[PDB]
């Protein structure tokens, strides 16, 4: 599913970001 | 940087899942605890709402939910034949708090984040661990992109169940999620991602008065009665 | 799968635990 | 409060999944660039390795790979009947480095993550965006955990390898994943992820002398050879 695959996407820029921001 | 108009919006947000053991299933996006806007049974999405690819995040929330219902139904609960889950999620910033609401045939469930107090009512058997959801983490993280993208979707629809955007003839039609009721001095309901219509017919009975009543407070009557189908907007009372 | 949702369940855990922890 | 044994440990672990239009499927777990410890084709998981239940994270990251890749053949590359992909994943402390490689019938793609450097070898046709992976925050997220309930079995699998846990018969086998190598003086090579076994026999020429070497530096002689087949640990040289 190209959705699921959207999410996941998604959540690796989520946890990227959320690491270069502490 | 954060916007301060989405900021401001506080909405609720109603997720539900239905599931059969027969292979049944519907899954639903519902707005300011409106008529659903969303429906999976590609989805059926409303013309003033976002794009299915706007809409993802939300898209792969209810998938999880429904494989936990199927997974619920295929491990236990096998006298029970239709399980269902609500998530009432209400954005008060960047903040949100989903309270989460099950329903078996022969049990229902509620439990509140804050008050963590969960109520059971019914003879069923449910897991209190259950009870409590899952996958909420994703709305939870995703609260900036969700309310920019339905900010304007969610006051638009406000703006659309308005006196002054109803139809009666009676039949009563406004093409907004905020749920109406029709009162006469047969009821033939129904709905649609886009309308909601209410029709009420009289078999030769005279009324001479047909009343109509929003979930955001007002209050109409369409009087009097014509002979043919012309449209009106509901008048003041 | 009981193996996605376990995941799941762990990741509503890390979530709920890096909010937090900050 | 972090583990300090389990920090101070560096090894690679290497999560590879193979896919053929035709259905085939294969996903696995390797360590310090090992043979497979986990084999999906419930898993085949070594006795020296940890309860399945335990390795649900990377279960989960293997899966979406599988997903990924079924998909990548169902939107595209349809001349190409299969697609593979391998992770190299680096544990130095707290941190991962996870270096991606895939592989069609007609193109060869590595990355590395911070040279960024993107190889292409081959006629066939790539994205460089799909060169890059996806899922790494699994692994990246999850650094503690992996560490330490796969800290045992990474150092147990090297005391294993040793030259005073080999048996030399020519048949030698050694169980564990570390690859040795089998030099005399036909060739059946195997796996399990138990053991690992390779067999040279000669069609009644005399050798007088039989090699053996590991991954891990080492080098053995088993000398004279014996009319039985009697079990010995390789002689050092
Ligand atoms: C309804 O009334 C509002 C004011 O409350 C006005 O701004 C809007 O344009 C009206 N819409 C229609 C279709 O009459
Ligand atoms: C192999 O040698 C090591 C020392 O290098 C020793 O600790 C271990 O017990 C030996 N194992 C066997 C089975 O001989």
């Known amino acids: 599913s190209m959705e699921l695959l959207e999410y996941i996407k998604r959540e690796q820029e989520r946890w990227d970001s959320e690491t270069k921001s502490v | 940087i954060v916007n301060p108009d989405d900021l401001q919006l506080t909405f609720t947000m109603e997720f539900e899942v239905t599931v059969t053991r027969d292979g049944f299933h519907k899954r639903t996006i519902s707005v300011d605890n409106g008529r659903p806007v969303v429906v999976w049974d590609d989805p059926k999405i409303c013309k003033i709402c976002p794009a299915v690819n706007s809409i993802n995040t939300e898209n792969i929330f209810l998938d ?9 139904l295929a491990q236990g609960l096998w006298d029970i034949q239709r ?3 609500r998530y009432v999620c209400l954005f008060l910033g960047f903040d949100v708090v989903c309270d989460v609401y099950h329903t078996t045939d022969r049990v229902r469930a509620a439990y509140t984040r804050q008050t963590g107090k969960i109520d059971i009512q019914g003879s069923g058997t449910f897991s209190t661990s259950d009870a409590k959801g899952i996958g909420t983490y994703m ?24 006196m002054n955007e ?9 093409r907004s999620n905020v749920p109406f009721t029709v009162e006469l001095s047969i009821v033939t309901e129904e709905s649609t991602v886009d309308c909601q219509t209410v029709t009420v017919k ?5 009324a001479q008065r047909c009343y109509v009543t929003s979930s955001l407070g007002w209050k109409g009557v369409v009087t009097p009665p014509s002979q043919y189908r012309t449209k009106r907007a509901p008048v003041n009372i």
């Open chain 2, 83 to 85: 399980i269902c889950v």
């Open chain 2, 202 to 206: 009289a078999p030769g009975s005279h």
């Open chain 2, 139 to 162: 709305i939870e993280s995703n609260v900036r992109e969700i309310k920019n993208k339905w900010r304007p979707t969610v006051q638009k629809l406000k703006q659309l169940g308005y």
């Open chain 2, 166 to 174: 109803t139809e009666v003839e009676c039949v009563v039609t406004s």
């Open chain 2, 64 to 72: 999880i939910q429904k494989m936990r219902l199927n997974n619920l």
